[PDB]
Design a protein around this ligand. Structure first.
Ligand SMILES: Nc1nc(N)n(-c2ccccc2)n1
Length: 339
């Protein structure tokens, strides 16, 4: 019979033994296990998406992207375990390097030195440069999706919400539904954007930088609507130039209806922060997405001078160019290489 963990089947075959329940992830149960071929403990996450088209989409995205990408700052897939036939395929197990912790857990309890903040931010952006060079948007960057090992090597994970960039089709109406994590949501998402441009990710990285500086999320919106409140509460009212860039009347007039708010200076919010870090923060957390700094510019910012080296910041060789039953088949096919 298959191995059991906390009631349910965690059937990872003979190669992976000594299972330990690590916790719950976005996809379900996650366990550590000893890899008998490589003699290391690994992370294994159990995925059960086949009953629902939406779950299948996210699982396929996660798998297809992570299998294509190969980068020091992006979590790899080492192995995928599943049944030999589609009919028997019940669950999929994704095997990854075991990572001590993640930035969410770390920030709950640990103060980061400026050196750590700098190093973490460099790695995030180095990983993001690769992702963006593949014409892909991560779209759910947040501390819990940044894994760390015992020597603080950082790896971006969870590409379930990722999309191919589509800037020509980015415009939408005001207060249009969105799925990515609220606190890390760029202001344009609530105004006139579907989140199909690279600038969406940079905003999230800015929030992450802010959160590393203080151990508190900078824009902790209590609900969808509240999020924009928090952002404007710190950036202050948008300029006329920036309003003029928003053609949609509902969005623009909403902003015009608000009482004036002044910018809160970054150095008053973060009195202990490196001034160069605050300069970079300001550029990532720019209201107008067209004026927001891009990943390659961020890497070249003086804050990151100790690490910046474009020849050692690789890009993707092959960028991405663009029902559940077919999705299960696609997932089955995408995972075939591990049989
Ligand atoms: N690669 C890896 N390593 C761990 N611990 N991971 C994990 C992922 C989700 C929840 C708990 C742990 N993932």
């Amino acid at each position: 019979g298959p191995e059991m963990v906390r009631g349910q089947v965690f059937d990872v075959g003979p190669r992976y033994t000594n299972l330990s329940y690590i916790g719950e992830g976005a996809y379900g149960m996650v366990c550590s296990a000893y890899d008998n071929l490589n003699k290391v403990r690994v992370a294994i996450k159990k995925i059960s998406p086949f009953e629902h088209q939406t779950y299948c989409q996210r699982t396929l995205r996660e798998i297809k992207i992570l299998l294509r990408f190969r980068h020091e700052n992006i979590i790899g897939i080492n192995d995928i375990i599943r049944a030999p036939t589609i009919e028997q395929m019940k669950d999929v197990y994704i095997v990854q390097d075991l990572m001590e912790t993640d930035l969410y857990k770390l920030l709950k309890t640990q103060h980061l030195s400026n050196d750590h903040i700098c190093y973490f931010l460099y790695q995030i952006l180095r990983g993001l440069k690769y992702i963006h060079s593949a014409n892909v948007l991560h779209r759910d960057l947040k501390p819990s999706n940044l894994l760390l090992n015992t020597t603080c090597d950082l790896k971006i994970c969870d590409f379930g919400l990722a999309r191919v960039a589509d800037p020509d089709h980015d415009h939408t109406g005001f207060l249009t539904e969105y799925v990515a994590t609220r606190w890390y949501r760029a202001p344009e998402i609530m105004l006139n954007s579907k989140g199909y441009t690279k600038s969406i990710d940079i905003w999230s990285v800015g929030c992450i930088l802010a959160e590393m500086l203080s151990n508190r999320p900078i824009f902790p919106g209590k609900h969808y609507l509240d999020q924009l409140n928090h952002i404007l509460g710190i950036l202050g009212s948008p300029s006329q130039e920036d309003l003029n860039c928003i053609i949609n009347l509902k969005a623009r007039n909403y902003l015009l209806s608000l009482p004036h708010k002044n910018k809160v200076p970054w150095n008053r919010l973060f009195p202990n922060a490196d001034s160069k870090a605050l300069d970079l923060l300001d550029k990532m957390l720019t209201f107008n997405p067209h004026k927001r700094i891009e990943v390659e510019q961020a890497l070249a910012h003086p804050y990151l001078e100790q690490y910046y080296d474009p020849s050692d910041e690789p890009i993707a060789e092959a960028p991405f160019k663009f029902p559940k039953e077919k999705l299960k088949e696609l997932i089955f096919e995408e995972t075939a290489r591990f049989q």
